[PDB]
Enzyme design. Structure first.
Site, PDB file in Angstrom:
ATOM      1  N   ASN A 265      36.952 -28.530  26.849  1.00 36.70           N
ATOM      2  CA  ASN A 265      37.647 -29.805  26.763  1.00 36.70           C
ATOM      3  C   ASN A 265      37.233 -30.725  27.899  1.00 36.70           C
ATOM      4  O   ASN A 265      36.698 -30.275  28.916  1.00 36.70           O
ATOM      5  CB  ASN A 265      39.152 -29.595  26.790  1.00 36.70           C
ATOM      6  CG  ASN A 265      39.630 -28.719  25.658  1.00 36.70           C
ATOM      7  OD1 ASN A 265      39.236 -28.908  24.506  1.00 36.70           O
ATOM      8  ND2 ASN A 265      40.465 -27.743  25.977  1.00 36.70           N
TER       9      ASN A 265
ATOM     10  N   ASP B 150      56.970 -24.148  20.107  1.00 33.99           N
ATOM     11  CA  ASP B 150      57.313 -24.897  21.317  1.00 33.99           C
ATOM     12  C   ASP B 150      57.886 -26.288  21.049  1.00 33.99           C
ATOM     13  O   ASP B 150      58.160 -27.042  21.986  1.00 33.99           O
ATOM     14  CB  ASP B 150      56.107 -25.001  22.271  1.00 33.99           C
ATOM     15  CG  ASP B 150      54.996 -25.908  21.764  1.00 33.99           C
ATOM     16  OD1 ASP B 150      55.168 -26.628  20.759  1.00 33.99           O
ATOM     17  OD2 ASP B 150      53.926 -25.911  22.412  1.00 33.99           O
TER      18      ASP B 150
ATOM     19  N   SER C  85      39.463 -27.662  30.840  1.00 35.25           N
ATOM     20  CA  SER C  85      40.031 -26.513  30.142  1.00 35.25           C
ATOM     21  C   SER C  85      39.107 -26.092  28.997  1.00 35.25           C
ATOM     22  O   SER C  85      38.153 -26.804  28.662  1.00 35.25           O
ATOM     23  CB  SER C  85      41.425 -26.853  29.614  1.00 35.25           C
ATOM     24  OG  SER C  85      41.368 -27.893  28.642  1.00 35.25           O
TER      25      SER C  85
ATOM     26  N   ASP D  87      38.889 -32.231  30.082  1.00 26.04           N
ATOM     27  CA  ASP D  87      39.613 -32.058  31.339  1.00 26.04           C
ATOM     28  C   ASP D  87      39.217 -30.767  32.069  1.00 26.04           C
ATOM     29  O   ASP D  87      39.745 -30.469  33.140  1.00 26.04           O
ATOM     30  CB  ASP D  87      41.131 -32.098  31.098  1.00 26.04           C
ATOM     31  CG  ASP D  87      41.648 -30.905  30.302  1.00 26.04           C
ATOM     32  OD1 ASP D  87      40.845 -30.051  29.859  1.00 26.04           O
ATOM     33  OD2 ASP D  87      42.879 -30.820  30.112  1.00 26.04           O
TER      34      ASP D  87
ATOM     35  N   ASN E  14      44.211 -23.180  24.000  1.00 26.75           N
ATOM     36  CA  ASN E  14      43.804 -23.921  25.194  1.00 26.75           C
ATOM     37  C   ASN E  14      44.233 -23.266  26.510  1.00 26.75           C
ATOM     38  O   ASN E  14      45.427 -23.034  26.727  1.00 26.75           O
ATOM     39  CB  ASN E  14      44.377 -25.351  25.108  1.00 26.75           C
ATOM     40  CG  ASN E  14      43.720 -26.320  26.075  1.00 26.75           C
ATOM     41  OD1 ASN E  14      43.070 -25.916  27.026  1.00 26.75           O
ATOM     42  ND2 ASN E  14      43.919 -27.612  25.844  1.00 26.75           N
TER      43      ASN E  14
ATOM     44  N   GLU F 107      39.288 -25.032  13.098  1.00 22.08           N
ATOM     45  CA  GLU F 107      39.235 -24.830  14.546  1.00 22.08           C
ATOM     46  C   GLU F 107      38.006 -24.018  14.956  1.00 22.08           C
ATOM     47  O   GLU F 107      37.354 -24.345  15.938  1.00 22.08           O
ATOM     48  CB  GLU F 107      40.499 -24.132  15.057  1.00 22.08           C
ATOM     49  CG  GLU F 107      41.764 -24.988  14.987  1.00 22.08           C
ATOM     50  CD  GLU F 107      41.744 -26.158  15.959  1.00 22.08           C
ATOM     51  OE1 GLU F 107      40.834 -26.223  16.815  1.00 22.08           O
ATOM     52  OE2 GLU F 107      42.636 -27.041  15.883  1.00 22.08           O
TER      53      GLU F 107
ATOM     54  N   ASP G  78      39.045 -24.086  24.973  1.00 19.20           N
ATOM     55  CA  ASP G  78      39.753 -23.547  23.821  1.00 19.20           C
ATOM     56  C   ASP G  78      39.059 -22.263  23.367  1.00 19.20           C
ATOM     57  O   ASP G  78      37.828 -22.214  23.285  1.00 19.20           O
ATOM     58  CB  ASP G  78      39.776 -24.542  22.665  1.00 19.20           C
ATOM     59  CG  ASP G  78      40.621 -25.763  22.943  1.00 19.20           C
ATOM     60  OD1 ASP G  78      41.399 -25.785  23.909  1.00 19.20           O
ATOM     61  OD2 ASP G  78      40.528 -26.708  22.122  1.00 19.20           O
TER      62      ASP G  78
END
Ligand SMILES: [Cl-]
Ligand SMILES: [Cl-]
Ligand SMILES: [Cl-]
Ligand code: NA
EC number: 3.2.1.17
Length: 129
Positions: free
Chosen positions: A46, A101, A50, A48, A59, A35, A52
């Site tokens: 990202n 989650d 957003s 969209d 994110n 990562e 990280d």
């Protein structure tokens, strides 16, 4: 901060990530390697809009606030900048929420594609833990 491999393993272990949600320490170190290359200051935008953040590339779409991801959530209740600190506490605490989650470590695409199903123990091999 750019952690060494065993240095990061020790930090993750102290903060209770070892076998958290059934994921051995090697899984977490492998995820961080691919990562962020062990760099706490890693950021990546990202498609969209957003971003990280940090060693585990958490994110802003869901987990932290950076003030520039419209419609996003802040489920870890932190500024995204806290995920860039040399101290990994905030990243670890938020990663514990993420991995809980429902999807386990599949939340980290690099983990699914580059760590999952591999000999992840190699990432903590030789470390004095
Ligand atoms: Cl925002
Ligand atoms: Cl630390
Ligand atoms: Cl799982
Ligand atoms: Na957010």
């Amino acid at each position: 901060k750019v952690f060494g491999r065993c240095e990061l393993a020790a930090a993750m272990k102290r903060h209770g990530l070892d076998n958290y949600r059934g994921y051995s320490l090697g899984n977490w170190v492998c995820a961080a390697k691919f990562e962020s290359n062990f760099n706490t200051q890693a950021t990546n935008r990202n498609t969209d809009g957003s971003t990280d953040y940090g060693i585990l590339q958490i994110n802003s779409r869901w987990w932290c606030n950076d003030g520039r991801t419209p419609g996003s959530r802040n489920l870890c209740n932190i500024p995204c900048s806290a995920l860039l600190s040399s101290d990994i506490t905030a990243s670890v605490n938020c990663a514990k929420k993420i991995v809980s989650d429902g999807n386990g470590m599949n939340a980290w695409v690099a983990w699914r594609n580059r760590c999952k199903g591999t000999d992840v123990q190699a990432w903590i091999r030789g470390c004095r833990l």
